[PDB]
A paper describes a structure:
Complex I (NADH:ubiquinone (UQ) oxidoreductase) is the first and the largest enzyme of the respiratory chain, catalysing the transfer of two electrons from NADH to UQ, coupled to the translocation of four protons across the bacterial or inner mitochondrial membrane. In bacterial complex I the 14 “core” subunits, necessary and sufficient for complex I function, are shared equally between the peripheral and membrane arms, together forming an L-shaped molecule. All known co-factors of complex I reside in the PA: the primary electron acceptor flavin-mononucleotide (FMN) is connected by the redox chain of seven Fe–S clusters to the quinone-binding site (Q-site) at the interface with the membrane domain. In this work we address this question by building and analyzing atomic structures of nine different conformational states of complex I, which were obtained by X-ray crystallography and single-particle cryo-EM.
The FMN is coordinated by subunit Nqo1 at the deep end of a solvent-exposed cavity that contains also the NADH-binding site. The binding of NADH relies on stacking and polar interactions. The nicotinamide ring is located in the inner region of the pocket, establishing a stacking interaction with FMN flavin ring while polar contacts with charged residues K2021 (suffix indicates subunit) and E1851 stabilize the diphosphate moiety. The adenosine ring is stabilized by stacking interactions with F701 and F2051. Binding of NADH per se had no major effect on the structure of complex I, as the crystal structure of the CXINADH shows a very high level of structural similarity to the crystal structure of the native state, CXIINT. However, this is true only after relatively short incubation times with NADH of up to about 30 min. Since at least three NADH oxidation cycles are required to fully reduce the redox chain in complex I33 and the rate of NADH diffusion into crystals during soaking is limited (probably at least to the scale of minutes), it is possible that these structures represent a partially reduced complex, where NADH is bound, but FMN and some of the reducible clusters in the chain are still oxidized. Importantly most regions around the Q-site show marginal changes in the CXINADH structure, with the exception of the key H384 flipping after extended incubation with NADH. In contrast to our original expectations, NADH binding and subsequent reduction of the enzyme does not lead to large conformational changes apart from flipping of H384 upon extended soaking, which likely plays a role in regulating Q access into the deep end of the cavity.
Author numbering:
A (entry chain N): 1 to 427
B (entry chain A): 1 to 117
C (entry chain 4): 26 to 205
D (entry chain H): 2 to 354
E (entry chain K): 1 to 95
F (entry chain 6): 16 to 181
G (entry chain J): 1 to 160
Write the structure that this text describes.
């Protein structure tokens, strides 16, 4: 009964924007997201399904993360176009529907419904924004066509469009591949990774925050329902992580480097799919969402258009707490103790080893060790000598959000046996 | 329902209509003076420029067509409820009413924003 | 869209060319272009007798001509001092207002037809036909009538003119009230 | 076609060819009658010439139509130039066989109709959309952007009101429950004259047909006196003839459909004659429509868009939802009669303020 | 079964279009062709597996209409002031 | 095929073209008002076949030059003649158009036959509406091969059929 | 069957080849409309009757109508401007188009299915209870998707 809250707020605001100032609309959107988050929590351990809409721990956790990302990215959006808020609402609802069903066709409708408002939110009208939106839309519709033929061949291998069917030989494998194409594209897995750097570089920074958190979250929420074979999973992980880290080595701009890093991180998250633990992946994505939203909130405080790596430098002297949280985020994404990224990474690797894929895991670990080069070149750059750089030291809004993100990251890294007990049915 | 023979009869209808249309066009084309001239083949309005060199046409017609495709999808969804109505009862009526209200919210949004633009 | 509304097309009465600077459905600005009817009354009148020019005066405004006839006659009278009989002045105002009725009929007919309905053109124009016949009684011509003179009017009215005028004057009030 | 037989394919082809040449003769003589009726409206009288009743003047017109140098204009698409009139005519002729001109077997043995598809209104809807297709395509192919803009106005308006046609047609489907015209006509046989139940939607159907070039937008446009129209202005001998032919067939198709759907398709309570009542109702609607042609002004396509989009279509869907509640709950069939009579009294009393 | 093979071939043709085309709109057309091939496969497997693929293809039509509307808005916004719709004309974002 | 090459077919199509005369006015001056008056409810050229009035030149066979033809308009009107379907006819209405009339000056074409091939001339100022009907009936019998000059010669059905346009 | 079935399939594939091959955008869209007509006939042949009629109404009648409206507002018919041709990608592209079918052909090869079901015609009479009901949730999701799509396009053009 959370989706009803989302729908009510969205539909009412669609008209209320004519009588309410965009700021009042922003307050309304924020209230709706907080109410939906609270309704999700009060239903913790209360799975609820009416039709093909089915809420389990996965729906609960991933929609909680998506709602967090939406709240954070709405805090920064201050444009006087109430539409620039409405779309955000949609995506949340859309992503909710993505994690809340097993029906492949409702999965497609949910994907389109959460993705379309992103295409429009990416228009600050900066000439790069147009190029980004065009690549995004074209490649996304291509992936949607592939995913739809996959759902069709699924219906061919089984009488229902719901996942879990027994499955045939070549036809079921082929349908699985045609679904995996779109799902990995949405999750920014290579060799479907091309769109992510360009789109993250072109889009306004807070929108990139929202994307790199909630879109990847919901994409893996949908992947968890699929029974992806180990060969496909291994190929995706290998190619994704390798290209992610390597192409990130060559990056000169923070947002493009972070997009390649997120490709590598989707490659890592693709390990928990070996078992579909939904506990390992839930934990990993919790930590990743917090850290990446933090990093992109800081980057938005720097510049929405584009931020080079040098702009990050001197940040500690500029703002100490900000530099500290940025260091925490770089290390947590590096998955280093005593930070929660280590626990998420370990849980994914434990799922992988339990599935019995060893060489893939070793290659992932080597690529993660290579990643430390730029992870430190970003985290440690905070202390460097400040060069010429625009700096907007946020409102107390973004400061408090960043502080809470870093605090939750370290708290759950130090004592993970606090929430990890309740990632199953929810005791 | 209806037998499939009616659809082959429909194909025959199309065949006769198309045949007669092509026959009429042949009558028109073959019976004529056929003295082509340079200015005769020129589009219109005395040398050049009926409209001439103009910027791309208003997007208003794009919006007209997009509105139309969306609302025709609406109607295509409303018809299956129109045929089976008494059987779907208040449940189907309520579902169709909520659906209609969603797309009517879309209409009211585009109207209070308007497209004179 | 610098649109070239050509002369006479699309159906732009009174041959005239228009350059409609136009974006969308509005009208940014219309640049008119005229001269397609330049005949040269002001030049040809320099080479025609005063009496002959009364044949050139109605042809400029061919709808309300008797105002041109009157203007030219009055100007030449004031120039050489002619004495207008009173009945000539009465008849001149009669013919002036009558040709004004015919001009106004044509203006509103063309306007309604140009955009709107085609029907109301006929009825008004029908009454115009009636008016035209009156001139044929006295001038022998529909319009371009050479009836005015320097002193007054050319010759006296027939017996049959006035009763037809009364017929039309009694049918007209209901008619104009119907258009209104 | 649950209870109705199927004629042989050769008989279907025979009836089709007959319907098409009859539509030809009908639109020629209806051009005559419209000329004379508009004439009578404006007290001038029509062509008492080449006839006497004029009934040999369309022959002279057709004789002009061919031999008139069917011209291929330069700067025009070689193929679409010739193809678009064919599209407009093909997709205009058909969708008229479905109209029942009598009870089964009343074609002197086989079938009053040509095809009686299970889904009729959808076929009508699709072939009505393809007419707008031909309109704006010919506008484009002409190579004249002046005429292109008129083609765009035409297409926009026709498309908007063509959308409204769906919500107009929704209401009676609830009552009859079938998408074949014969079931609907038989329902008007039993309960009687569906417009009594659904007069408001009938209205938004009627006015919708005005937007399909019938009249009073009248900024369709025709090339005359406004931003010139599309789909003509570059075709001379036979293609122009095909454009006018298809437009008039569409006019008469609407004039025939309006009584078939809401009012009494022939099926009279009295004298139950197959063809004569339907043709006479066609004549009534045609005369009222020519009255409109003569008697009313233009709309300028902006107020036309406003009236169609903001007024007609929401009203049609409101009535559809009302009828849907009533039918699914099936409480009486009387409630719709009462509500339509009351609504007509409302939309009537507001006139003479 | 020839229907399903033809749907696969139409998907392949749409792939060839998306890859070969230079214009954005023609790529979008090839994608629509891919969608219709998918719909044909769905109708065949509904004939096989009990009629659900028909409602499936209906919802697919509606999804297609949504994405067509939004994508054409995009195509408008990006190439309104700009020159030729050629998709290679925008190479600002490089690796 | 030009309405020719069969003894019956050419008389038939001459009948058809004659009663199917579609007048396309090119309203220039006070002649044009007396042509518009030939459409009202006293004297309508709406019987012989001339009811419909297509402003487009691609659609009409009779071109009626009704008014003075000033030189600045001479090519424009000219092109409307070139942009007409080939079975086309041209009438010169009034004195200013037929000859230079009384405006025998620098501005006015002294015979519209200069720019367009004229079929029939109709004097008058303005030519009475019934006279314009007379000229269209004259043209009717001219395209029937029923028209002779003062010198005994029969006049061909279509003027503008004998000219090397350029 | 096979008599006209071969015809329909040959026309379908030929139209696809046109829509992907022709450089006339208008002619490509027209070949896709012809494809849609052939495909609606195929749909009806497959006992889906309502779906073929909507395929003509919405897809051909509405979608590619807006496509044509866009390419007529923005001429774009001669697409080959601003080339960057990458000529060698033209054969290579087809290669991938081959594979994307072949593996599908492999997954569908040697695949025989029970094509025996009395659909009773794909009429909406039976689809009503299926749509409003088992699909009502997917229906309402679709409706919200379209409403949001309208809002997205409005805010996307929105010159201000
Ligand atoms: S001939 Fe007489 S009526 Fe005709 S344009 Fe000349 S002045 Fe006017």
């Amino acid at each position: 009964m959370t989706l009803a809250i989302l729908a009510v707020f969205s539909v009412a605001l669609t008209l209320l924007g004519f009588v309410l100032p965009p700021q009042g609309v922003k307050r309304a959107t924020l209230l709706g997201l907080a109410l939906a988050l609270a309704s999700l929590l009060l239903t913790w351990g209360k799975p609820f399904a009416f039709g093909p809409y089915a809420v389990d721990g996965v729906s609960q956790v991933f929609t909680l993360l998506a709602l967090l990302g939406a709240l954070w990215t709405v805090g920064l959006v201050r444009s006087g176009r109430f539409e620039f808020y409405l779309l955000v609402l949609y995506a949340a609802l859309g992503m909710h529907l993505l994690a809340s069903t097993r029906h492949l066709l409702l999965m497609l409708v949910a994907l389109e419904a959460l993705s379309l408002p992103l295409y429009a939110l990416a228009t600050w009208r900066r000439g790069q924004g147009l190029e980004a939106a065009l690549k995004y839309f074209l490649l996304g519709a291509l992936a949607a066509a592939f995913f739809l033929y996959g759902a069709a061949l699924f219906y061919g291998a089984t009488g229902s469009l719901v996942l879990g069917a027994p499955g045939e030989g070549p036809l079921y494998a082929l349908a699985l591949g045609l679904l995996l194409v779109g799902l990995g594209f949405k999750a920014a897995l290579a060799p479907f990774h091309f769109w992510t750097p360009d789109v993250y570089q072109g889009s306004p920074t807070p929108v990139v925050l929202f994307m790199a958190t909630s879109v990847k979250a919901a994409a893996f929420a949908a992947l968890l329902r699929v029974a992806a074979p180990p060969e496909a999973l291994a190929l995706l992980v290998a190619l994704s992580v390798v290209v992610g880290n390597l192409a990130a080595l060559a990056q000169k701009e923070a947002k493009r480097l972070l997009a390649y890093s997120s490709i590598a991180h989707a490659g890592y998250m693709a390990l928990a799919l070996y078992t579909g633990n939904a506990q390992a992946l839930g934990f990993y994505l919790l930590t990743y969402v917090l850290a990446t939203g933090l990093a992109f909130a800081v980057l938005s405080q720097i510049s929405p258009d584009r931020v080079p790596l040098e702009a990050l430098r001197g940040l500690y002297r500029k703002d100490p707490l900000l530099g500290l949280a940025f260091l925490v985020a770089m290390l947590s994404l590096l998955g280093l103790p005593p930070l929660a990224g280590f626990w998420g990474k370990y849980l994914a690797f434990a799922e992988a080893a339990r599935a019995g894929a060893w060489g893939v895991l070793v290659l992932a670990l080597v690529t993660s060790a290579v990643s430390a080069y730029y992870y430190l070149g970003l985290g440690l750059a905070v202390f460097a000598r400040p060069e010429e750089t625009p700096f907007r030291p946020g409102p107390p809004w973004a400061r408090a959000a960043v502080v809470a993100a870093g605090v939750l990251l370290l708290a759950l890294g130090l004592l993970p046996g606090l929430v990890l007990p309740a990632l199953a049915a929810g005791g | 329902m209806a037998p499939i023979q009616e659809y082959v009869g429909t194909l025959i209808y199309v065949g006769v209509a198309l045949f007669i249309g092509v026959a009429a066009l042949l009558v028109g084309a073959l019976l004529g003076p056929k003295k082509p001239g340079r200015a005769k083949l020129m589009p219109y309005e005395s040398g050049n420029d009926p409209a001439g060199e103009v910027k791309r046409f208003p997007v208003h017609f794009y919006v007209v067509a997009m509105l139309f495709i969306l609302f025709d999808v609406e109607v295509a969804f409303l018809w299956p409820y129109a045929v089976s109505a008494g059987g779907l009862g208040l449940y189907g009526f309520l579902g169709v009413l909520a659906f209609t209200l969603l797309l009517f919210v879309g209409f009211l949004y585009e109207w209070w924003k308007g497209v004179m633009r | 869209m610098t649109l070239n509304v050509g002369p006479q097309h699309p159906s732009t009465h009174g041959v005239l060319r228009l350059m409609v600077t136009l974006s969308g459905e509005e009208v940014l600005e219309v640049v008119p272009h005229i001269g397609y009817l330049h005949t040269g009354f002001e030049k040809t009148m320099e080479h025609r007798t005063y009496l002959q020019n009364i044949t050139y005066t109605p042809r400029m405004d061919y709808l309300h001509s008797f105002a041109h006839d009157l203007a030219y006659a009055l100007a030449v009278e004031k120039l050489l001092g002619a004495v207008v009989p009173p009945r000539a002045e009465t008849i001149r105002v009669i013919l002036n207002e009558l040709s004004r009725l015919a001009s106004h009929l044509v203006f509103l007919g063309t306007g309604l037809l140009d955009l709107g309905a085609l029907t109301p053109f006929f009825y008004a124009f029908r009454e115009r036909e009636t008016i035209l016949d009156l001139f044929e009684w006295v001038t022998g011509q529909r319009f371009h009538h050479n009836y005015i003179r320097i002193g007054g009017v050319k010759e006296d009215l027939p017996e049959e003119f006035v009763p037809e005028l009364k017929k039309l004057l009694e049918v007209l009030p209901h008619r104009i009230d119907e258009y209104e | 076609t649950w209870s109705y037989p199927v004629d042989p394919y050769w008989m279907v082809a025979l009836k089709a060819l007959l319907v098409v040449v009859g539509l030809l003769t009908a639109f020629a003589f209806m051009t005559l009658i419209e000329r004379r009726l508009l004439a009578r409206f404006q007290v001038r009288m029509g062509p008492n010439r080449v006839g006497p009743f004029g009934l040999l003047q369309p022959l002279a017109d057709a004789i002009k139509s061919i031999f008139k140098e069917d011209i291929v204009v330069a700067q025009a698409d070689r193929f679409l130039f010739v193809l678009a009139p064919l599209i407009s005519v093909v997709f205009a002729l058909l969708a008229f066989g479905l109209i029942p001109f009598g009870p089964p077997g009343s074609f002197f043995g086989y079938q009053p109709w040509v095809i009686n598809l299970d889904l009729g209104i959808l076929y009508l809807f699709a072939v009505s959309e393809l007419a707008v297709y031909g309109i704006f395509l010919s506008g484009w192919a002409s190579g004249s952007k002046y005429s292109l803009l008129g083609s765009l106005r035409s297409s926009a308006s026709l498309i908007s009101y063509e959308l409204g046609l769906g919500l107009a047609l929704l209401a009676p489907v609830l009552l009859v429950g079938s998408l074949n015209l014969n079931d609907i006509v038989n329902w008007q046989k039993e309960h009687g004259w569906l417009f009594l139940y659904a007069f408001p939607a009938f209205l938004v159907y009627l006015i919708a047909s005005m937007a399909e070039a019938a009249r009073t937008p009248f900024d369709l446009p025709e090339a005359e006196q406004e931003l010139v129209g599309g789909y003509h202005t570059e075709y001379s001998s036979i293609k122009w003839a095909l454009f006018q032919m298809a437009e008039y067939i569409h006019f008469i198709t609407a004039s025939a459909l309006i009584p078939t759907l809401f009012l009494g398709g022939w099926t009279m309570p009295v004298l139950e004659v197959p063809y004569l009542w339907m043709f006479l109702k066609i004549a009534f609607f045609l005369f009222f429509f020519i009255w409109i042609r003569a008697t009313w002004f233009r709309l300028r396509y902006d107020q036309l868009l406003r009236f169609g989009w903001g007024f007609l279509f929401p009203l049609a869907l409101l009535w559809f939802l009302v009828t849907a509640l009533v039918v699914a709950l099936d409480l009486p069939r009387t409630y719709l009669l009462y509500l339509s009579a009351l609504s007509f009294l409302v939309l009537l009393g507001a006139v003479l303020y | 079964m020839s229907y399903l093979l033809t749907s696969a071939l139409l998907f392949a043709l749409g792939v060839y279009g998306v890859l070969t085309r230079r214009t954005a709109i023609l790529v979008f057309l090839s994608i629509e062709l891919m969608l219709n091939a998918a719909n044909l496969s769905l109708v065949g497997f509904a004939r096989a597996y009990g009629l659900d693929g028909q409602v499936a293809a209906l919802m697919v039509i509606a999804v297609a209409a949504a994405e067509v509307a939004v994508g054409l808005g995009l195509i408008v916004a990006i190439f309104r002031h700009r020159e030729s719709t050629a998709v290679d004309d925008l190479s600002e974002l490089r690796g | 095929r030009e309405g020719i090459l069969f003894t019956t077919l050419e008389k038939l199509v001459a009948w058809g073209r004659s009663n199917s005369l579609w007048p396309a006015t090119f309203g220039l001056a006070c002649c044009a008002i007396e042509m518009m008056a030939s459409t009202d409810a006293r004297n309508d050229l709406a019987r012989f076949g001339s009811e419909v009035f297509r402003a487009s030149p691609r659609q009409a066979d009779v071109m009626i030059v009704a008014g003075r033809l000033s030189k600045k308009m001479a090519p424009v009107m000219r092109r409307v003649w070139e942009q007409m379907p080939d079975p086309k006819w041209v009438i010169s209405m009034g004195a200013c158009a037929s000859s230079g009339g009384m405006f025998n000056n620098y501005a006015i074409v002294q015979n519209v036959d200069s720019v367009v091939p004229v079929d029939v001339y109709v004097p008058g100022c303005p030519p009475r509406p019934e006279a314009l009907i007379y000229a269209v009936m004259q043209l009717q019998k001219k395209v029937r091969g029923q028209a002779y000059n003062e010198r005994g010669e029969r006049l061909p059905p279509v003027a503008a059929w004998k000219r090397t346009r350029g | 069957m096979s008599l006209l079935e071969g015809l329909a399939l040959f026309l379908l594939l030929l139209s696809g080849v046109l829509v992907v091959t022709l450089r006339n955008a208008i002619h490509a869209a027209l070949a896709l409309i012809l494809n849609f007509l052939v495909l609606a006939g195929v749909y009806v042949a497959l006992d889906a009757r309502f779906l073929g009629f909507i395929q003509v109404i919405v897809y051909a009648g509405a979608i590619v109508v807006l496509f044509l409206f866009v390419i007529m507002l923005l001429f774009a018919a001669q697409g080959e401007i601003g080339f960057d041709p990458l000529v060698r990608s033209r054969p290579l592209a087809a290669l991938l188009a081959l594979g994307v079918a072949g593996i599908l052909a492999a997954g569908l090869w040697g695949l025989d299915l029970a094509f025996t079901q009395d659909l009773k015609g794909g009429l909406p009479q039976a689809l009503g209870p299926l749509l409003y009901g088992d699909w009502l949730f997917v229906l309402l999701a679709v409706g919200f998707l379209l409403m949001a799509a309208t809002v997205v396009a409005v805010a996307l053009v929105e010159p201000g």
